[PDB]
């Protein structure tokens, strides 16, 4: 039962948003919250995903990973929404140097050895976002 369901690391105890979605299983809500908070290592306020392999003994194994490139593009742009009709009117612009900086920060967990290929994947994500390089 491994489906990633998580919120930003700043808001501990996700009682409104996820809640029963992280707690169908017998693993406790408080256990999930303390495992998510155990967050404090790097930064808070940004969504940090995690793979949750739940066993029969309710001692789940969790493997954390890097924050999504979408909200990282948001932090690079400094804007909130950039998807509403981008072709009819361009909403934002990201530097390719900034995208390569994002790629070399994301080179840890992102599946790829070619940094330029991961970069051009990232401005693929950026054109899908709507912001034109």
């Amino acid at each position: 039962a491994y489906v990633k369901l998580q919120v930003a690391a700043g808001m501990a105890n996700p009682s409104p948003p996820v809640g029963p979605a992280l707690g169908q299983q017998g693993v406790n809500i408080m256990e999930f919250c303390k495992a998510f908070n155990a967050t404090d290592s790097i930064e808070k306020g940004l969504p940090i995903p995690v793979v949750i392999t739940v066993y029969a003994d309710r001692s789940f194994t969790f493997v954390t990973k890097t924050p999504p490139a979408a909200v990282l593009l948001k932090k690079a742009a400094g804007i909130k929404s950039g998807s509403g009709k981008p072709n009819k009117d361009k909403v934002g612009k990201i530097s390719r140097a900034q995208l390569q900086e994002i790629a070399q920060t994301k080179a840890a967990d992102m599946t790829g050895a070619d940094i330029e290929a991961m970069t051009r994947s990232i401005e693929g994500t950026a054109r899908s976002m709507g912001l034109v390089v």
């Binding site: 009682s15 409104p16 809640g19 029963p20 707690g23 169908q24």
Partner: protein, 353 residues
């Protein structure tokens, strides 16, 4: 930077007024509760109550985080303004100006969503002033009230034109219907439905005895007169029978249950055409009766509230203006009757009355 200081003070004051009118802590309490029963998972085992919970959750959380981020914006803009006064960092001061404008516009959007919550609020309106059973004093009061409302409409920027104006023989106008056109006119003017209480030393009386006259302002939006759609062949039941050839045509509208017969003409087609015009006429009549019945039900409710229609009180003898619904008072009667009702209409619209 003095307009910036006054502007931050104005935002602080209007934010406090908004919190008082919105009752922030109570809505936060229901927000926390709705979050809690969302956390218990049976709420998604029932579909529709989760629908309602999602609606109320989104509304409460949006209002709560809006007021919270305006608190944070007020405090950090104040602190960074204190920085910008002494350190004189021009770019950081420009950043303060930009973020202050963004916060003001976003709280403006919040209070906007509250004050224009009506579905007909965006449309133009028909606003009517009618004097009471008093006489020429009520006539004069209706006329100068019409003057004041024209002055308010022109000051706001709404385009006015007098559709009808029934005057009195001595002075004043007995009744007047005005088209106020422009965006958000009905939303701006919808709190004016009700009664105004004039107390003044009457000039028309010979002895100078003071008079207590009344007038009503009644505003209603320009609803679209929708076209009356024709009736369906399946919705009709067509019969032919012998007239008293079976040229007689009995058309029956089945879903409502209304029949019309026609037998006077030898042509069955002529009989059917007259029956179809009778169908259309009765359908229009029934739609008008349904509309009038709904209007009568609304009138039953607002006649039930009754005395609550007395919304405004001008005591020109003692020179005080009073909104009883919001309870607010002022002393500048000449400014009020000039048309400076912005404070009163904003108070009423934030009250939601």
């Amino acid at each position: 930077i003095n307009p910036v200081n006054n502007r931050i003070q104005d935002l602080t004051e209007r934010s406090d007024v908004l919190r008082g009118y919105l009752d922030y802590d109570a809505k936060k309490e229901r927000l926390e509760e709705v979050n809690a029963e969302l956390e218990q998972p049976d709420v998604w085992n029932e579909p529709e109550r989760a629908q309602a919970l999602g609606k109320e959750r989104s509304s409460l959380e949006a209002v709560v985080d809006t007021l919270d981020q305006m608190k944070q914006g007020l405090e950090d803009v104040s602190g960074l303004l204190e920085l910008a006064v002494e350190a004189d960092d021009e770019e950081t001061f420009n950043e303060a100006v930009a973020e202050l404008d963004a916060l003001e516009e976003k709280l403006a959007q919040l209070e906007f969503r509250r004050m224009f919550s009506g579905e007909y609020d965006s449309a133009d309106c028909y606003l009517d002033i009618q004097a009471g059973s008093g006489g020429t004093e009520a006539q004069d009061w209706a006329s100068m009230l019409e003057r004041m409302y024209l002055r308010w409409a022109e000051s706001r920027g709404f385009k006015t034109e007098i559709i009808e104006e029934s005057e009195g023989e001595v002075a004043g106008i007995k009744s007047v219907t005005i088209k106020i056109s422009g965006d958000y006119a009905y939303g701006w003017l919808r709190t004016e439905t009700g009664v105004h209480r004039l107390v003044r030393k009457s000039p028309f009386d010979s002895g100078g005895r003071r008079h207590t006259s009344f007038s009503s302002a009644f505003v209603y939006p320009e609803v679209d007169d929708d076209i009356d759609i024709e009736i369906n062949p399946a919705d009709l039941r067509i019969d032919v029978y012998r007239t008293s050839t079976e040229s007689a045509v009995r058309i029956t509208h089945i879903p409502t249950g209304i029949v019309t017969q026609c037998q006077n003409d030898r042509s069955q087609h002529k009989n059917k055409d007259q029956a179809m015009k009778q169908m259309k006429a009765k359908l229009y009549e029934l739609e008008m009766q349904k509309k009038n019945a709904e209007k009568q039900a609304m009138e039953d409710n607002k006649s039930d509230i009754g005395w609550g229609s007395q919304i405004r009180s001008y005591v020109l003898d003692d020179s005080r203006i009073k909104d009883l619904r919001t309870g607010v008072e002022t002393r500048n009667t000449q400014a009020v009757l000039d048309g400076s009702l912005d404070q009163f209409i904003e108070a009423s619209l934030k009250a939601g009355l």
